[PDB]
């Protein structure tokens, strides 16, 4: 018998390249994580984040509501946190 | 009359209130995802219905941040007619047929959505809601597709009513998302402690290295003995047509073409098959050659002999 | 028991890298 | 004002005035 | 439930023979499903015609 | 049923389940399932009267369709 | 170092530019962003993601289509093989007999199987200077044996 | 008549399969702005940037002079302003 | 006119992004 007479487009090559394609970005997908995890460690090994998802939880509060003007008020502080790292460390701090 | 009256109904009403969207989204990404397991006119097919389940999605974001129950209304009556009606068209089937439930529980997902209505607070990640593990695994997966991450905030921008940009509405989700996954490994490690200076347990080493060291090992071998695989399996039957027997003698002149052809040529049966191999059953790989080679596979070279073709 | 709670633990580390661990 | 309002942030907001 | 397992038969016996006797059959059951749950309480003794 | 026989058969109550018992007041109405039980009877009436060697999932579906009848009946 | 001070100038021209486009044309605040401004970035985000995978297949498969250049078969073997035994009636033509249809010639043909439409359309779709003639011979000296 | 018999080089293969690796490239190329914006809104949000221009463009000048002593002090002011994100916060300032 | 100029501000803002946003 012979070896590959399949169908669907090319069983040989339309399809299997495509899912070729597909896996390799996927690689890049996921190797965008553990590649390169210790370049943020300075600012990702913050310990509480609550006060910060207040502060991203009222962005989307005041979406809702449409006070679009303290968005960006809100916003500022965002960026400011994330400006300064100094503050995140006070922001971030376990207890207090 | 009446069915202004059902029209009022769905759209006015005095009903509660859900948010079913993850549910449906959920729905329509097993869809996209059998369908794009589905490529088997048929790769035009199965590309048009990719363009489509995208496009539903995309539309169907859109009346959910804008809150629509009219939109989601006609969306529905639309969609299902539409979809209904693409079983018409089915010259380019089990994918197919699970492509159609999964699309019933997404309609009917969203009729709930419609007799239902819109809750007031739509916004918020639905995996960043609470901080036990089944959320942060979700959210990671989830957020760990490649387009997905990108798709939302830009189509979440043009719906939702901001005063900022696209890069500004990029940079509150990736912070968001980054303080989620942070939140929820700060509420495990509170949840389940281990002491100080103690080994963090061999077992959990074992489980979590054990893991990438497969992961990485399906990167490399398994594709390659998954190709071979495949490649190995001889198709389809393959035999001889006709039995061309030119016993070119004279030197000169070769002749003797006495030949024959289909008619004459007998794919041998299931039966005859055992008869070959058990005639040369006693030779190991005699009998081999024959039982490996597939039944109706053996042809029987049945040669003619007579003649008239002159010798030249 | 505890080992299926220390394995629970152990896949889900492993996951907690799947999006900066 | 945006262009002015979006860019007013300053140390005063990040005082520790009773942030429930 | 006895008076349903017949009209279940009484449907069946239409299906599988083929045939104009078969259509009455797939008729009397139609008929002793919509109007049935009434006369499985009143003929019980009541006139069972 | 619509996954079993296509065409006329079925994408009339499938068609009307997800736009007009789903879509509505909370429970459907009394119209619809009179409407589901009188097509599935049509539907095997016209199968019976030849599609050849016609299937039955219809049996299946007018005796769901009268279970439920009962069950709403009682209340 | 070099590529370093390349990098700051680069990145802080980028914000100038942007920073001096803000104090020209200015925006008020609480004022949605417009809803025109989302449609149109937006818009074209899309539309240049479309063109990452649909635009490629549709140019792709469009040249595929294309049936590039003309293929005449250059002989008429006809070999009618009639004997069970000993096939021949060999008698058969090559490229002088065999005649390329000239562009009058493909009209004939359309024309007269024009009432079948896909007869017709058959004929017409191919090319002119596609159907080619089978002028096959048939006389023989050839013998039968 | 055939599908594919055109010329340069293998109209089927060579120059595409070249045109190919240049798309998948180029959009590697692309990606590499709108993927990691988030990894810098903590050195990159920043109102006024003329003091730093001003300190590049006098870097231009030094060495248009050849006066390179000064190039690499005025290297200096331009590390030590991205190595501590806070003097970057004082020396951005909108007004002063 | 203001429809004109809406419309090359928003390219401005996606080309805008075209490097580091």
Redesign the interface.
Same mark, same amino acid.
């Given at each position: 018998k012979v070896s590959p007479p399949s169908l669907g487009f090319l069983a040989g090559y339309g399809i299997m390249g495509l899912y070729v394609s597909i896996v390799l970005v996927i690689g890049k997908f996921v190797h965008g994580f553990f590649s390169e995890i210790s370049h943020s460690i300075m600012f990702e090994e913050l310990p509480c984040v609550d006060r910060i998802l207040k502060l991203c939880q009222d962005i989307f509060l005041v979406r809702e509501t449409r006070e679009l003007e303290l968005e960006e008020e809100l916003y500022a502080k965002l960026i400011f946190l994330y400006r300064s790292p100094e503050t995140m460390i006070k922001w971030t701090r376990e207890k207090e | 009359p009446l069915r202004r009256f059902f029209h009022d109904i769905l759209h006015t009403k005095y009903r509660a209130a859900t948010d079913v969207y993850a549910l449906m989204f959920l729905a329509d990404v097993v869809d996209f995802i059998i369908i794009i397991f589905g490529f088997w006119q048929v790769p035009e097919a199965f590309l048009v219905m990719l363009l489509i389940q995208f496009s539903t999605m995309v539309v169907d974001r859109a009346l959910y941040l804008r809150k629509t129950v009219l939109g989601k209304l006609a969306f529905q009556v639309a969609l299902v007619l539409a979809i209904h009606l693409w079983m018409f068209f089915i010259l380019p089937n089990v994918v197919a047929q699970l492509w159609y439930f999964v699309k019933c529980i997404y309609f009917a997902l969203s009729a709930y959505q419609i007799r239902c209505g819109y809750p007031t607070r739509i916004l918020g990640n639905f995996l960043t809601k609470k901080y036990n593990h089944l959320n942060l695994f979700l959210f990671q997966g989830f957020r760990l597709v490649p387009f997905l991450v990108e798709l939302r905030a830009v189509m979440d921008w043009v719906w939702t009513d901001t005063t900022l940009s696209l890069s500004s509405w990029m940079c509150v989700e990736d912070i968001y998302a980054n303080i989620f996954i942070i939140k929820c490994s700060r509420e495990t490690e509170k949840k389940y402690p281990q002491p100080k200076g103690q080994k963090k347990k061999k077992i959990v080493k074992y489980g979590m290295g054990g893991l990438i060291i497969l992961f990485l090992i399906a990167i490399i071998w398994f594709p390659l003995l998954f190709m071979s695989l495949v490649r190995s399996v001889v198709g389809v039957v393959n035999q001889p047509i006709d039995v061309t027997v030119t016993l070119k003698l004279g030197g000169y002149e070769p002749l003797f073409t006495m030949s024959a052809q289909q008619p004459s040529i007998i794919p041998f049966t299931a039966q005859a098959y055992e008869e070959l191999s058990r005639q040369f059953d006693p030779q190991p790989l005699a009998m081999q050659f024959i039982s490996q080679y597939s039944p109706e596979d053996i042809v029987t070279a049945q040669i003619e002999g007579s003649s008239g073709a002159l010798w030249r | 028991c505890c %080992?299926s *709670?220390? &394995?629970? %633990? =152990? !896949?889900? %580390? !492993? &996951?907690? =890298? &799947?999006?900066? *661990? | 004002d945006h262009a002015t309002v979006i860019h007013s942030g300053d140390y005063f907001l990040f005082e520790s005035d009773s942030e429930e | 439930y006895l008076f349903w397992l017949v009209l279940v038969v009484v449907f069946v016996t239409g299906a599988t023979r083929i045939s104009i006797f078969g259509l009455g059959y797939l008729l009397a059951c139609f008929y002793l499903l919509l109007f049935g749950t009434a006369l499985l309480q009143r003929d019980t003794r009541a006139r069972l015609v | 049923n619509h996954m079993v026989t296509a065409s006329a058969g079925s994408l009339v109550l499938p068609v009307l389940v997800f736009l007009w018992a789903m879509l509505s007041i909370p429970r459907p109405s009394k119209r619809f399932w009179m409407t589901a039980i009188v097509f599935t009877e049509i539907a095997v009436v016209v199968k019976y009267l030849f599609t050849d060697g016609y299937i039955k999932y219809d049996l299946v579906q007018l005796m769901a369709l009268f279970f439920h009848r009962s069950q709403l009946l009682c209340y």
């Open positions: - | - | %080992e *709670s220390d &394995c629970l %633990e =152990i !896949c889900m %580390e !492993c &996951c907690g =890298i &799947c999006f900066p *661990s | - | - | -």
